């Protein structure tokens, strides 16, 4: 297939489906006619798109954990605990990393070893191996909407299975589920394969079945400047809407400066709506998800609560529709159900302690918002230029030329030239610009802000500051100060 | 420190890369020649690199938890490739979940790993251990 | 002695000291000449007043816990743990309640019972029974400044012992350590005995020994409107300055709405400085302390962390010089050293995650600040008028006539007519005004804000909402919504 | 007719008052005549109120933790004052610190308290126990 930002025809989409469903024997359990009927029978309280609408209307932030284990019954018991004891508003199913690399043979071995060991040797739920039948058992055992959360360059079959399995949201995108999650996958291929995932949701919407799609804002979770992260999210939203997706949650990973994070989430939401309307997508329901600190966590569990709950306070004051819950086991390993529930309870407590409260507008916030919108528009303008008006082609050439560049991304198709670092108040700025197409005025503001940190710390801004910032939160503070 | 060559990678289907970058930075600064095969590396990539570069040690990083699977059998393959006695280190977040550390260390040592590192191990600990083990303190 | 807001003469004060020092045999260990030399040998790192100055200078918020047990060595080990493992910036010593009621006989029995049981049967440290000798042993065993934290209407002897013991801050005030802490003590008598505690600090300052004084802002910890709380703190600050106090930390208890709380702390600091300078006290160094939620806590420890850390975020963004640490045992009992260190670590993590960040000015914040200052000035204006220019007499008469009125105060000299309740955003407002001398405009703003809650909840504003608000946080949310 | 009278206070050198006000409210709303002696109340104040009002029960609240000292001997003094068999309730935060609750409950029952309540007990629990114990359910 050639890559073009255009809705696949029904015929072209059907041809792809028939190939994709053959990639594992559980694909034979996907019956689009039957799945539509099953999806339409799901109560609204368990439909992710409809509950997001509810959250927007009521102006509340919903808490969603991450969670997944190899075996079906243990996974169900896990999700039931996070629902019942944790108080989750949405439920995940986090997919294991073998599935994300399409290694269902290794999934199966991991399943058997997990059975033998009495504990999960997989780092998530192998949804392709458990098939439509298993994913439905998960949905039928819980009372909350379910969303696949993962990190999969080629998610086509996983998407067929989890949607037919009644999970009414799929997370990911052709950029955000490639560059942080792969090394050898071309941007062109991941975009094409994520066109399939968006097109499947488009098909379902055309039958009246509402399914949420959530681009993965945080990317590498390591000092991603808001404007580069927002440019990715806006791009993936536009690419999804073209394939017929109607319900989109754009996401952002916390950087830690409250004003910057609130500016970012508002710019993300405002410019996502603006760009969707500019390009003729007039019936897309946009929500936001704020991810609690996605960098290295401190190992001390009390300090972990300090990160979890400050992060939640930022999410609540930003007016995030959703917040993703970190746990006090973040530094160590996949959380126990008790550690996860602990994080959920602390998060929802914080949310209820902040009911209805929003950061009011200020000069400082409006200034940071204009910075981010200007920086994001530089990147997106150049992408449309490079693609000669086609955003999907422009994304490929943007990565080829370093116009879009994700810090620390393992993908060999990521230039790895742009370098981020915090300023003196902890705002993530651009240290090295690479080929990121900023005006001199925008570059000067980044340098001005960084120079204040050089003055305060008595040292030149440098990659050592970047390393310090990478370790700072794990060592107990936001900013990587000397010593 | 006298120069020695190590192979460094992230094993299996694991895509975490920031630690790989720091470890390469740190072990390079300490005077090592780091042959960095990067993320998503099967066992064969470590061994092929160790052979081509005549490495003194293989540092297997494993963050995503499934290293307990991926790491089994590396020593045997190193023996069969003629790398008998090569140093094998494994660190990161190498099992799924918080576990009792003495049990984890024995599990990976029994797989044939010379040193086994807990979550949050500073690279300086690995560098000091490697200098000791290569007797170049 | 008659009550006047006039600095005691050296002769008057000395006459009182010789009476006070006879109230327990440990008064014989107090040698003012010797104590001055001892205080002057404490390094600056261990002087509370001087460390507050450094905190203000560096723009940082310092975390201070509460802590106290019957026995000396156990208390020392406790404080060392909070210092070393907790990372405290300041150390308390919380006095037991028998001391606060001057029942040193019962202190002595509790010491003996605590020795027999191997655990503290006292809820704090009996500083008077342990004497200067004991209090100096605490100071010599720690590396941080020491403050007595208590709740004592007649603190004269305690103050003598703990200051001569090297503790360079004393918390309290003639109002804030009477009405929430006493039943039968007249306002005139507690004001007079606190004039003593203030005058002792004034003597020490005249010798060049710097000692901090901290009025107890939160009062009853139970929905205290910011303007009533601030009027108390400004009053106690002015009454202390008149006796020669030079270093004062005015305090405020979190109400839970971030904008209201930040408005409250800034109004408190601004009007304290304004009033001090208006009344000719031109060399007083003012700092602030923000108390994390002083109402009922949730029993669940993760939820408790949610309160602890949201509260810390408010304190940091407010620019508080100091924040007092709650622990996850708040709902249950006096925390273990581990639960206290847990609270300190979560708090300090939050502070370090917010380094240098402050709430920027907003129209919303500007409005709430104007409301609070106007409300506070009505109360203080009426007090001065009632006292014919004398604030101490004005305070006695304000309590006699309900001009100053502290929600749920046990003091029979507290009118108990003013009734507080939260508005639809969680801001504490006046539900019933009693005799609080507000203008009709001020009253009408309070009613308008409360009507939004009636409209939103579908029920009339009422004392039932007050009950609901009293229980809400323990039940997992700020606002006592129905059902 | 017979409307039941209780004595309600906070024992010892304890000044906590909000719970006392809530308990007064709720037990009044439940139909009890509440003789509220308030905070900072020595044992004798409970006994004197109980005699003057012919109270059917004394509800001792102790929040500040030193109730394990202050509560000892109430039952005996109630016997010696002629109030044999009166209901003695104690609730709040009655020992210093988080403790194993069954141990605490037995300790206060061993002092002669009929019912002992853990932190955070709703008034409605005490109201229901008191109606049952007084056979007015
Ligand atoms: C940022 C992050 C992400 C980013 C990574 C971006 C990228 N490509 O690099 C994103 C969000 C994409 C990501 C994805 C996922 N992640 Co992640 N990630 C992290 C996080 C938050 C920090 C890692 C980091 O960069 N640290 C900073 C660097 C400098 O430190 P480091 O990586 O830990 O490595 C240092 C030390 O460990 C040590 N070290 C490491 N290896 C070795 C080896 C030797 C020999 C020695 C001596 C020392 C040593 O030195 C290194 C340098 O300082 C951690 C949790 C945490 N630590 O708080 C989770 C974590 C590693 N992730 C985890 C998981 C499970 C996932 C996924 C695998 C999810 C899944 N179920 O598939 C996916 C990846 C998909 C895949 N194919 O593998 C888990 C692992 C669980 C377990 N082991 O039980 C963790 C621990 C989180 C958790 N508690 O659940 N993640
Ligand atoms: C607000 C508060 C304060 C205010 C009180 C204002 C006032 N005068 O009322 C202030 C700040 C002044 C205060 C002071 C102190 N406090 Co205080 N306070 C609290 C707090 C935060 C909430 C209490 C409250 O009002 N709750 C709401 C009301 C409605 O409920 P309640 O009082 O808990 O009681 C309910 C239930 O227990 C039950 N109940 C209570 N008694 C009874 C009896 C019966 C028979 C029944 C059936 C039910 C029942 O029904 C009540 C109503 O619903 C608690 C901790 C918490 N709960 O989160 C600490 C707490 C009670 N305080 C405590 C302490 C130690 C102190 C001091 C004694 C400090 C000291 N070392 O001297 C001082 C008081 C000095 C003195 N002389 O006693 C400790 C007790 C420690 C322990 N027992 O191990 C607590 C538990 C905090 C802690 N975890 O350390 N406090
Ligand atoms: C670093 C990856 C981002 C986040 O992804 C969470 N995550 C991944 N896999 C699982 C799982 N199987 N169960 C519970 N949480 C999981 C980690 O905790 C981390 O916060
Ligand atoms: C309710 C009193 C306010 C705060 O005062 C703390 N407090 C009182 N006494 C001690 C003590 N002896 N040790 C540790 N904290 C103490 C309580 O926990 C509460 O948060």
Author numbering:
A (entry chain B), C (entry chain D): 1 to 483
B (entry chain A), D (entry chain C): 1 to 137
Study text:
We have set out to test this AdoCbl‐activation hypothesis with two “stretched” AdoCbl‐homologues, designed and synthesised as potential structural mimics of “activated” AdoCbl, provisionally named “homocoenzyme B12” (AdoMeCbl) and “bis‐homocoenzyme B12” (AdoEtCbl). AdoMeCbl and AdoEtCbl are bound in a base‐off/His‐on form, with distances between cobalt and the coordinating histidine imidazole of 2.21 Å and 2.17 Å, respectively, similar to GM‐bound AdoCbl (2.22 Å) and free AdoMeCbl (2.19 Å). In both new structures, the electron density for the “stretched” AdoCbl‐homologues indicated an intact bond between the cobalt ion and the terminal carbons C6′ or C7′ of the 5′‐methyl‐ or 5′‐ethyl‐adenosyl ligands of AdoMeCbl and AdoEtCbl, respectively. The refined Co−C bond lengths at 2.07 Å or 1.98 Å for the bound AdoMeCbl and AdoEtCbl, respectively, were somewhat longer or slightly shorter than the 2.00 Å observed in the crystal structures of AdoCbl and AdoMeCbl, [25a] but in stark contrast to distances of >3.2 Å observed between cobalt and C5′ of the adenosyl ligand in GM reconstituted with AdoCbl. The distances from Co to C5′ of the Ado moieties of the bound AdoMeCbl and AdoEtCbl were 3.2 Å and 4.2 Å, strikingly comparable to the distances between the Co‐atom and C5′ in the two observed structures of “activated” AdoCbl in the crystal structure of GM reconstituted with AdoCbl. The adenosyl moiety of the bound Cbls and its protein environment are positioned at a nearly indistinguishable location in substrate‐bound GM reconstituted with AdoCbl (GM‐AdoCbl), AdoMeCbl (GM‐AdoMeCbl), or AdoEtCbl (GM‐AdoEtCbl), clearly defining a firm H‐bonding “adenosine‐binding cavity” (ABC) that intimately interacts with the substrate‐binding site. In contrast, in GM‐AdoEtCbl, the organometallic AdoEt unit displays a ribose E1 (C1′‐exo) conformation. In the case of AdoEtCbl, an intact Co−C bond is also observed, but the E1 (C1′‐exo) ribose conformation and a strained conformation of the linker between the adenine and the ethyl‐Cbl moieties are indicated.
